[PDB]
Design a protein around this ligand. Structure first.
Ligand code: MET
Length: 521
């Protein structure tokens, strides 16, 4: 069924400045968005900020400034950061937005009418820093900034506090069977698979009901009032999760400002999310609470939740800084190549340089220069191939198979594997070039060079197309060197081998141009 491909990041708490975690989550969101746009689909990619709640209000009180001022400023820092990082997110949502607040009230009211919200009590542990309710099994002993004996979260290690409050309760327990049915009927709905197993095991064990309001004093009045009861505020997570629904309902202008909230999500064809990108730290909220709310409201469920191995929240790592040093595309490639769904990845300067030099410069960059060199490509054009050998055909087969292979990986989604698949083809092309030695062929066998050169050019085009969501700016430079017309830089038609006809002219040269400058050890 044709709809707008809808991909999201988490919305980030504004208690603190943007750092690598948020940049990474949003980068994944952006790449998925970009790949689907490259496929020729309609796309709406969403990111933003989570601005209410005890955590933010206490950060504001520490900084000695009003929550309104504080959130607006920090939100500004997130926007600047995401502009600097050269993402292509369609909209930046803030939970302080009045249209979002309206949507939250609608959803709350819907849950209440459905009978799924009642007045009760929460008495138990709470991590303010995670805005999370915890059972006694999920806490243990530890220390605070003052070095005092306190209780901490087993999840996150943050300080926990005992809360005893009359709260509005959501009947989460009533949704256990339906959630299990959903997980089992849609075994690709949570990625990676071991995180899916975790969610299933947790829900199988049983679900308590969930507090969805707090006393207003507790949150320093910095939250959305409960409809028909201004003594209570809406739980920051029901508030926050609802952003995906709000985003799905905002008409947005050319400048990126929201201009209108539609009544019916179907009008914009975005809801529900095709992919919610999150960190492992917020899996329960997105794979248990969120769908339970949607089930209560009779709203459609998201297709995929992908949870990565990082946390969303004297060893600094600043992505803007590193991008200015090593290059923006390069840095993005590294972050997406270096790690899959684990915390198991060497993010040092040494490894960054190793991948820059080895993969980007020596494998990709070298190859681009070879097939566009005046020495080898004497006519500065795509030549017409002669007859193919069996060796030619083996390389051609790999290039033809690549789009389907990379497509599946992108759709999982598993961006690391998609990159590896493309670079496996790039290594193969390099080896082919080394065996055919086109530099010798210029004098020896011009007819044979035509064939070798054409396959090389075409291999570079196809790999680069499939890499364009990862290296958005560098892909443009490469296509410019190859003289690939704009029309051939996107669309599934152009995944096919042979889409750029012989006789196409290469792009102009530059006196000492390089794609990726190698760096010292
Ligand atoms: C609805 S996604 C909310 C994410 C949360 N504010 C965090 O930073 O972990």
């Amino acid at each position: 069924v044709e709809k707008v491909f809808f991909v999201t990041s988490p919305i980030y708490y504004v208690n603190a400045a943007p750092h690598i975690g948020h940049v990474y989550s949003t980068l994944i969101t952006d790449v998925i968005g970009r790949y689907h746009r490259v496929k020729g689909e309609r796309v709406f990619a969403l990111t933003g900020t989570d601005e209410h709640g005890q955590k933010v209000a206490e950060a504001a009180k520490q900084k000695q400034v009003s929550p309104y001022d504080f959130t607006t400023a920090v939100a500004g820092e997130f926007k600047k950061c995401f502009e600097q990082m050269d993402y292509s997110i369609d909209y930046f949502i803030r939970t302080t937005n009045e249209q979002h607040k309206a949507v939250v009230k609608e959803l709350w009211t819907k849950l209440e009418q459905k009978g799924d919200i009642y007045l009760g009590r929460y008495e138990g542990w709470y991590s303010i820093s995670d805005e999370s309710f915890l059972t006694p099994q999920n806490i243990t002993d530890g220390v605070d900034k003052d070095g005092n004996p306190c209780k901490v979260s087993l999840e996150s290690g943050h300080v926990v506090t005992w809360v005893s409050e009359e709260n509005y309760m959501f009947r989460l327990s009533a949704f256990r069977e339906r959630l299990l049915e959903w997980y089992h009927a849609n075994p690709g709905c949570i990625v990676p698979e071991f995180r899916r197993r975790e969610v299933i095991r947790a829900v199988e064990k049983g679900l308590p009901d969930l507090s969805v309001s707090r006393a207003r004093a507790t949150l320093h009045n910095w939250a959305i009032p409960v409809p028909g009861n201004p003594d209570h505020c809406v739980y920051v997570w029901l508030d926050a999760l609802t952003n995906y629904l709000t985003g799905s309902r905002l008409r947005v202008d050319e400048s990126g400002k929201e201009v209108s909230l539609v009544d019916d999500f179907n009008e914009l064809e975005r809801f529900p999310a095709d992919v919610h990108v999150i960190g492992k730290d917020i899996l329960k909220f997105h794979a248990i609470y969120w769908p339970a709310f949607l089930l209560s409201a009779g709203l459609p469920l998201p297709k995929k939740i992908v949870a990565h191995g990082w946390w969303t929240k004297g060893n600094v790592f600043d992505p803007v800084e590193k991008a200015e040093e090593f290059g923006y595309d390069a840095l993005k490639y590294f972050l997406l190549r270096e790690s899959g769904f684990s915390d198991d990845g060497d993010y040092s300067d040494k490894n960054m340089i190793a991948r820059l030099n080895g993969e980007l410069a020596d494998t990709l960059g070298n190859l681009v220069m070879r097939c566009t060199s005046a020495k080898i490509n004497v006519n500065g054009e795509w030549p017409s191939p002669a007859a193919y050998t069996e060796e030619d055909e083996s390389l051609i087969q790999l290039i033809k198979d690549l789009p389907g292979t990379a497509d599946h990986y992108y759709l999982i989604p598993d961006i690391q594997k998609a990159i590896i698949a493309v670079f496996d083809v790039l290594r193969a092309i390099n080896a082919y070039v080394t065996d055919m030695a086109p530099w010798k062929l210029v004098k020896t066998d011009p007819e044979r060079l035509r064939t070798v050169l054409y396959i090389t050019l075409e291999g570079v085009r196809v790999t680069t197309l499939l890499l364009s969501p990862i290296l958005p700016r560098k892909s443009v430079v490469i296509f410019d060197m190859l003289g690939v017309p704009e029309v051939h830089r996107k669309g599934i038609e152009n995944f096919e081998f042979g889409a750029v006809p012989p006789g196409t002219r290469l792009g102009p040269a530059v006196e000492g141009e390089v794609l990726f400058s190698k760096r010292s050890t």
